[PDB]
């Protein structure tokens, strides 16, 4: 069924990708789908490679899915991750603002604080929180990256340009756009908070649970609610910034191999999905968290025929992004 060229960002994902192909080949017949690995330094290089027919697939946060749909790449979502459980799949997750207990500040008091973001342009780590704080930012609010840098007193916004927006990398010099940057992604943003570099981490509802197994340790953290109060990390359903579409695998519109990508991932989730194998796991890895796919995912769902990013993401989230990039006060 031909080979799907998967795009791995940096060495940790490259390692997991190699294991993915090795294990798939050990259980799949010469008739079944196979995986090949193409390593890039950033998800941006992956989008380029896919559009240039140098790679076939890569999983992207919904905010990035939107970006990849823009010309001249025009990539489309083909397979979505789903969370929660297989019995009740969730094609969305909650964006939350995690902070340390007794730090003494609410959402409307974030000015002058230090921020840890999953990455520039990502849903929970950027689009949602910055979209909500837009008008609190000092003018001129454009370019947004600089206004955010001026609002906080130091941040870590992976993938941001450290030359033009130096303070956005104050918490993670260089703003590396891969796991090479220890403060990249959900768990990286959380570590940025835990280590004490930042005062707040913009991540998802499962992030703290993925990093602190004991409740006693989680009790030292809280969430900032939109009504300017704080609640326990377990109460995210009643204290989140917003809900966002799940991260999805994108591919080319023409000769994109979406049928094979699904065939590969569908069989893969049966062989190496949650609790399926003692040899390999699609949703976890001894090499790191959220490599290739999010650890919080429980499986995959095929995206409807020919659906583009805008339609897939939904009018609400698309509007959120457009209002962030446009909008006034
Ligand atoms: Fe995300
Ligand atoms: K500042």
Swiss-Prot record:
Disulfide bonds join 7-46, 17-37, 116-192, 135-329, 156-172, 159-177, 169-175, 225-239. Has a bilobed structure, each lobe binds a single Fe(3+) ion. Does not always bind 2 Fe(3+) ions. (Microbial infection) Binds to Neisseria transferrin-binding proteins A and B via its C-terminal lobe only. The L3 helix finger of TbpA inserts into the C-terminal lobe of TF, altering its conformation and probably disturbing the coordination of iron 2. Electron microscopy suggests that in the TbpA-TbpB-TF complex, TF is captured directly above the loop domain of TbpA in a chamber of about 1000 Angstroms(3) formed by the 3 proteins, where interactions between the proteins serve to abstract iron 2 from TF. Binding to TbpB does not alter the conformation of the C-terminal lobe. It is found in: Secreted. Belongs to the transferrin family. It is linked to Atransferrinemia: A rare autosomal recessive disorder characterized by abnormal synthesis of transferrin leading to iron overload and microcytic hypochromic anemia. Transferrins are iron binding transport proteins which can bind two Fe(3+) ions in association with the binding of an anion, usually bicarbonate. It is responsible for the transport of iron from sites of absorption and heme degradation to those of storage and utilization. Serum transferrin may also have a further role in stimulating cell proliferation. Hydrogencarbonate 1 binds at residues 118, 122, 124-125. This is Serotransferrin. Transmembrane segments: none annotated. Monomer. Part of a complex composed of SLC40A1/ferroportin, TF/transferrin and HEPH/hephaestin that transfers iron from cells to transferrin. The gene is TF. Residues 4-326 form the Transferrin-like domain. Expressed by the liver and secreted in plasma. Glycans are attached at residue 30. The modification Dimethylated arginine is found at residue 21. Fe(3+) 1 binds at residues 61, 93, 186, 247.
């Amino acid at each position: 069924d031909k080979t799907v060229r998967w795009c791995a960002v940096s060495e940790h994902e490259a390692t997991k990708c190699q294991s993915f192909r090795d294990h798939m080949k050990s259980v799949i017949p010469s008739d079944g789908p196979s995986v090949a690995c193409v390593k890039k330094a950033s998800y941006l290089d992956c989008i380029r490679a896919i559009a240039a027919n140098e790679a076939d697939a890569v999983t992207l946060d919904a905010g990035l899915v939107y970006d990849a749909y823009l010309a001249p790449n025009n990539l489309k979502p083909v397979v979505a991750e789903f969370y929660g459980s297989k019995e009740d799949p969730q094609t969305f997750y909650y964006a939350v603002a995690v902070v340390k207990k007794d730090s003494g500040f609410q959402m409307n008091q974030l000015r002058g604080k230090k921020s840890c973001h999953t990455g520039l342009g990502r849903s929970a780590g950027w689009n949602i929180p910055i979209g909500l704080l837009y008008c609190d930012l000092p003018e001129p609010r454009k370019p947004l990256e600089k206004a955010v840098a001026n609002f906080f007193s130091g941040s870590c916004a992976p993938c941001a340009d450290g030359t033009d927006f130096p303070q956005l990398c104050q918490l993670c010099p260089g703003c590396g756009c891969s796991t090479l940057n220890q403060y990249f992604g959900y768990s990286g943003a959380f570590k940025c908070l835990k280590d004490g570099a930042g005062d707040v981490a913009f991540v998802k509802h499962s992030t703290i649970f993925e990093n602190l197994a004991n409740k006693a340790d989680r009790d030292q953290y809280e969430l900032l609610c939109l009504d300017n109060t704080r609640k326990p990390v377990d109460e995210y359903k009643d204290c989140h910034l917003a809900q966002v579409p799940s991260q999805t695998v994108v591919a080319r519109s023409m000769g994109g191999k979406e049928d094979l990508i699904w065939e590969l991932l569908n069989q893969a989730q049966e062989h190496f999905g949650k609790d399926k194998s003692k040899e390999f796991q699609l949703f976890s890895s001894p090499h790191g968290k959220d490599l290739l796919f999010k650890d919080s995912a429980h499986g995959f769902l095929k995206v409807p025929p020919r659906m583009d990013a805008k339609m897939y993401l939904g009018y609400e989230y698309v509007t959120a992004i457009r209002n962030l990039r446009e909008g006034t006060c």
